[PDB]
Design a protein around this ligand. Structure first.
Ligand SMILES: [Cl-]
Ligand SMILES: [Cl-]
Ligand SMILES: [Cl-]
Ligand SMILES: [Cl-]
Ligand SMILES: [Mn+2]
Ligand SMILES: [Mn+2]
Ligand SMILES: [Mn+2]
Ligand SMILES: [Mn+2]
Ligand SMILES: [Mn+2]
Ligand SMILES: [Mn+2]
Ligand SMILES: [Mn+2]
Ligand SMILES: [Mn+2]
Ligand SMILES: [Mn+2]
Ligand SMILES: [Mn+2]
Ligand SMILES: [Mn+2]
Lengths: 97, 105, 78, 93, 94, 108, 99, 86
DNA sequence: TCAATATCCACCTGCAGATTCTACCAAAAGTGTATTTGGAAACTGCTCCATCAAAAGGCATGTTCAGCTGAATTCAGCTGAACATGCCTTTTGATGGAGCAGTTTCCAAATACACTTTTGGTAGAATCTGCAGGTGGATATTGAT
DNA sequence: ATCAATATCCACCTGCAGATTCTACCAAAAGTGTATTTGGAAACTGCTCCATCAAAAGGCATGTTCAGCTGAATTCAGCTGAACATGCCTTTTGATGGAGCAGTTTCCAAATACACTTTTGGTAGAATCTGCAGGTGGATATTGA
């Protein structure tokens, strides 16, 4: 009848995922999101399977990168919890906004 | 007739580099040494990365270099990291790194 | 479909990014960013597709779009 | 049909630094991207360099200045030597 | 004395068309030339790349058009594309 | 021979179609350059310099000046979402910045 | 009394003033000296077109001003109003000028 | 024919000048340590631009750095400057 | 420190998806020729860069002083983590048909050439004028009382 | 809820530095009559992309505790802003010598354009072999006590 304290398992996951390289977003859901968006620029499109993978890789490398800068912004404000405000500042300094 | 690579003492295709410069619309004419020089530069950088990725593999008890290994060699090298700072290596993940303030104790 | 991108999957991404604690509002915030990222890239790719007069988006179209957006990717033809 | 890549060359160079090591396909793909990218970067800069100086030919001098402007400190030095070493050897015998 | 070309003459014409009353300092004209040279570079560059990705050895108004859609944001693109096309169909009407 | 008509007037343009055509050929962009390419490009450039001169001219008027200077160009650009993005990584000499003070800094 | 503006009032007066103007804020000669020094350490016996020095000053000031905007956002984000070295460092790290 | 020795010119970027730049950048309050970090940051910025500019000067086999050298040097660094194009 | 629960870490092991080999044709790359021509000397005509002299006032420097801001200390209401529970959407193949990249095979239209002939542009000159820089009255704004 | 102390906002001048218009010579568009090449066009031909199916089985969606983090409140030492006195050194003008950019020609050494001859690299089956993914057993790291 035991539990790990808040954050212990979090650190454990940081360690696991920083060690691996597998894509972290489920494939099907992603392929579905991709085609939906594309459908708005041109209808009835077909995608090489590798084109969808390239997209998922870029997209996941971008988010992982964005979460690093966001973590830094949150720590800057003496917090340990990231918030929309942190993603906002990071994207602002990066000049994405 | 011996290849320009062997003559330049390279493993990289001087002939191909020359054809690629001529057809890439970079300039109207291309000197004979430019393909040689360029090919040497490309070979050297290629050896630099393979050398470090080979090491990264060995430090992993692996003999086949994979994407993760190329990522560890690059991000763990100040100069290579700067050169590829805006490049993303598919299937290479990220360097293990946890901000101090996030550790327990 | 954006909701297909789930909380736990966003948690994982966050984790690889070294994030320990996550506020509840981050999930919806993340999908918005994810969506702007994909729209900007896909749009650029489909433009390379339509130009090559194809109906199939190729890995190269994506690689060329990414390069344009300053997100150069290695491993798919360049 | 046919698709030319730098694979055999990357592989040859691999054996000279790590005779014992092999390289997965996905990794070979990454090395190709690497070589194409650096090629474009150097060629592109040599292109501008010649244009700024109103020259119609890209010589080894443009490739070298390009390397200096593109690669970080030590990488530039070593790349520069390898380059002039290869051109030198090529111009002799 | 190797004469140095510029877009000043045309920037000035266009200026008179939109603001008949208004003038432009030489520094501001300096900035306008940089702007025109920059956009030309970006468009031709992208056009160059585009033609190359499709084994095409020639850059046509079609390459310039896709370059424009890729480089300019929303509305600015829509309008530039109209003017571009309008100029081409007119030019071809001899 | 026949009347000498500039390609610009043939295209209904102010910008130099001939000049732009030579720049394409001599810029090493491609082996060959189509006829409509320099016409289409000269028009896009002209449209863009007309869009920012329209806006700059207004800033000039707003500041009660009849002569456009660099600051006027900055205002027109940074105040226009689209031009600001197009030139988001460009710096206009002697243009300064937009007046903008964060709310939190104002007297409470 | 004499009269004394409260701390912050003059600073705000200065922001409005400098954001209104476009002139360079660093003195010419000192800046020209800094350029010649740094240059000299790279290659000797160099000369500079007057334009070149001015192009450099225009670029440096546009860059510092822009860096201070970002730095200012970082301070505020930490619920402060005083920019500190750590803010400038956070901005450059996120701008990728040096992770 | 000896010009004096150039030393410590970074101190030519005075406290007042940095305060003004922060002002234009909209900064209201400035920590006492900002001034040394700023000079450090400016130093790095300048060197990279001057280094690249001087590289273009030498490739052109000139002894004079022109405004164009700086313009190309800035463009290389994604810091494009309008107004000195020639 | 005990003691238990759930995590990691190792050393072996065996099948299987990739890898590394092995066996052949065409584009590419290397040659031997004939022409071309870019841009490296060899001057030298003039920009404009480095320096010096001198005077003057805008501004940097260095202080005093105290307002109010950053930083340290509490505190407790909630948010976000850890988990056990229950369930359906993603993953994994295998089949099959079809859409559609890649090609081959034309050729009429569109480009590049060569060179002559015809002006639009650009380098000053000369002529014309915003507005920088000054200067006093509103009009406010700020801050003490 | 004034007032007094200052800072800011404006409209009125008007000669100087620049901007705009006037003049001429080319460098370079525009015209024309060939010579070449590109790439749009049907017709096919596989390659690989969607569907359609099924299971299973993770992996995700829900609720329940409650640990411990964030944000609100207070307190105050002393940092950093505002105001001043001083007088340094950047600015502003002018003038001069001369380093070194261009601007011209003159001419190979080196690159392009060709026509062939020979070799190498991309393919499409062969012939292994590096670890992924489990197993088991042995300390670890956490946590509640
Ligand atoms: Cl938030
Ligand atoms: Cl060469
Ligand atoms: Cl065309
Ligand atoms: Cl700090
Ligand atoms: Mn020195
Ligand atoms: Mn010649
Ligand atoms: Mn003093
Ligand atoms: Mn006190
Ligand atoms: Mn406070
Ligand atoms: Mn509690
Ligand atoms: Mn005329
Ligand atoms: Mn005034
Ligand atoms: Mn001389
Ligand atoms: Mn072979
Ligand atoms: Mn294993």
């Amino acid at each position: 009848p035991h539990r790990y304290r808040p954050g212990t398992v979090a650190l454990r996951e940081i360690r696991r995922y920083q060690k691996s390289t597998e894509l972290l977003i489920r494939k099907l859901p992603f392929q579905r999101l991709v085609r939906e968006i594309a459908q708005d620029f041109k209808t009835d499109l077909r995608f090489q399977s590798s084109a969808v993978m390239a997209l998922q890789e870029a997209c996941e490398a971008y988010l992982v990168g964005l979460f690093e800068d966001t973590n830094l912004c949150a720590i800057h404000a003496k917090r340990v919890t990231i918030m929309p405000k942190d993603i906002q500042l990071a994207r602002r300094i990066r000049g994405e906004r | 007739a011996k290849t320009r690579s062997s003559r330049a003492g390279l493993q990289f295709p001087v002939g191909r580099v020359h054809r690629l410069l001529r057809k890439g619309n970079y300039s109207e004419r291309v000197g004979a040494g430019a393909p040689v020089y360029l090919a040497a530069v490309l070979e050297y950088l290629t050896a630099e990365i393979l050398e470090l990725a080979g090491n990264a593999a060995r430090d992993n008890k692996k003999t086949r270099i994979i994407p993760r290994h190329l990522q560890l060699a690059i991000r763990n090298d100040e100069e290579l990291n700067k050169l590829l700072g805006r490049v993303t290596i598919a299937q290479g993940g990220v360097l293990p790194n946890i901000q101090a303030v996030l550790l327990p104790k | 479909n954006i909701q297909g991108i789930t909380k736990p999957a966003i948690r994982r991404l966050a984790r690889r990014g070294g994030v320990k604690r996550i506020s509840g509002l981050i999930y919806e915030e993340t999908r918005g960013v994810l969506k702007v990222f994909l729209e900007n890239v896909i749009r650029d790719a489909v433009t390379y597709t339509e130009h090559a007069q194809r109906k199939t988006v190729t890995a190269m179209d994506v690689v060329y779009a990414l390069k344009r957006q300053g997100r150069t990717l290695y491993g798919f033809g360049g | 049909s046919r698709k030319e890549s730098y694979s055999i060359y990357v592989y040859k160079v691999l054996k000279q630094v790590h005779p014992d090591t092999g390289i997965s396909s996905k990794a070979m793909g990454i090395m190709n991207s690497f070589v194409n990218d650096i090629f474009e970067r150097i060629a592109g800069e040599a292109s501008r360099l010649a244009h700024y100086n109103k020259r119609s030919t890209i010589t080894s001098r443009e490739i070298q200045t390009a390397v200096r402007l593109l690669l970080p400190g030590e990488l530039a030095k070593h790349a520069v030597s390898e380059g002039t070493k290869a051109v030198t050897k090529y111009t002799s015998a």
